[PDB]
Motif scaffolding. Structure first.
Motif, short mmCIF file in Angstrom:
data_model
loop_
_atom_site.label_atom_id
_atom_site.label_comp_id
_atom_site.label_asym_id
_atom_site.label_seq_id
_atom_site.Cartn_x
_atom_site.Cartn_y
_atom_site.Cartn_z
N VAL A 124 -7.12 4.13 -2.52
CA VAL A 124 -7.11 3.95 -3.97
C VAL A 124 -6.35 2.67 -4.29
O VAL A 124 -5.26 2.46 -3.76
N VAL A 125 -6.90 1.85 -5.18
CA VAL A 125 -6.16 0.70 -5.68
C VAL A 125 -5.20 1.21 -6.75
O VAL A 125 -5.62 1.65 -7.82
N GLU A 126 -3.90 1.18 -6.43
CA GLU A 126 -2.86 1.74 -7.28
C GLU A 126 -2.11 0.69 -8.09
O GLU A 126 -1.36 1.06 -8.99
N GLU A 160 0.81 -1.21 0.00
CA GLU A 160 0.00 0.00 0.00
C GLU A 160 0.84 1.27 0.00
O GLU A 160 1.86 1.37 0.70
N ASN A 204 -1.37 4.83 -1.10
CA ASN A 204 -2.67 5.42 -0.81
C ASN A 204 -3.64 4.32 -0.41
O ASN A 204 -3.99 3.46 -1.23
N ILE A 205 -4.08 4.31 0.85
CA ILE A 205 -4.96 3.25 1.34
C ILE A 205 -6.40 3.38 0.88
O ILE A 205 -7.20 2.48 1.13
N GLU A 252 -0.91 -3.66 -4.64
CA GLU A 252 -1.41 -4.21 -3.40
C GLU A 252 -1.56 -5.72 -3.46
O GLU A 252 -1.81 -6.32 -4.51
CA CA Z 1 -3.89 1.38 -2.28
#
Ligand code: CA
Ligand code: LXW
Length: 223
Positions: free
Chosen positions: A57-59, A52, A54-55, A62
């Motif tokens: 947003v799925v970037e 992770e 940004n917790i 993950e």
């Molecule tokens: Ca994320």
């Protein structure tokens, strides 16, 4: 983290977020199947979130893996916070890569004056409340046992150390609980407790991981 800085995505690749519908604690990946966190982070229904930044947003880096078992230290005392450590077993092994990596356990304790890296998604204000999306970092030195005991008379055990700044302004905080204190490439502390965050003469108090390596190793050999 109060008074810290944005780490940079995936520059702390052993940092995990514990999620129970929302981020509630940090932790540290110590091998492909196990996370170290704080005993005061115990709850049921934990999903471990690796890779992770940004917790919210799925970037794309993950890994979300449910816990299959949590093991709070047998001697944890939820009143004194002595032995504030917990192991979390992943339901499947993480895939280790440049963004998801384990942190070594210590073989020796760290020393006063050593500069360490503390990280998390906790509150960034010393008065008031603001929770960040991206991972925050703080460089902080280990404090002498005598300064730690002067700050918290009657409350520091041989399983705790202080790190931070007696002048205040820079510290860990609520929501950083369970996350790492890394010094010379080893997991030497777990974010545990303090009197407020970033207050004068009240540095953060951290679980002294070097005292738990035998318990960790024997527990992971049998679970
Ligand atoms: Ca994320
Ligand atoms: N300040 C409280 C705390 O550290 N709590 C509350 C639960 C989570 C953890 C936390 O935020 N830990 C992270 C942290 C806090 C402060 N500096 C550094 C890191 C503490 C207390 C500990 C555990 C359980 C109950 C209370 C406390 C101590 C004295 C008076 C009130 C509260």
């Amino acid at each position: 983290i109060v008074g810290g800085y944005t780490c940079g995505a995936n520059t702390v690749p052993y940092q995990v977020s514990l999620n129970s519908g929302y981020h509630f604690c940090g932790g540290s990946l110590i091998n492909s199947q196990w996370v170290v966190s704080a005993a005061h982070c115990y709850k049921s229904g934990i999903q471990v979130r690796l890779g992770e930044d940004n917790i919210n947003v799925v970037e794309g880096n993950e890994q979300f893996i449910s816990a299959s078992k949590s093991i709070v230290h047998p001697s944890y005392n939820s009143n004194t916070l002595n032995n504030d450590i917990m192991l979390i077993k992943l339901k499947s092994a993480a895939s280790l890569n440049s963004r998801v990596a384990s942190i070594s356990l210590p073989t020796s304790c760290a020393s006063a004056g050593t500069q360490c890296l503390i990280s998390g998604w906790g509150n960034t204000k010393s008065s008031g409340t603001s929770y960040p999306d991206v991972l925050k970092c703080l460089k902080a030195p280990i404090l002498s046992d005598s300064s730690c005991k002067s700050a918290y008379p009657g409350q520091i055990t041989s399983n705790m150390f202080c790190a931070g700044y007696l002048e205040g302004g820079k510290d860990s905080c609520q929501g950083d609980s369970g996350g790492p204190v890394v010094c010379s490439g080893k997991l030497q502390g777990i974010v545990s407790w303090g009197s407020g965050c970033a207050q004068k003469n009240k540095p953060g108090v951290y679980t002294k991981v070097c005292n738990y390596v035998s318990w960790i190793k024997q527990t992971i050999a049998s679970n």
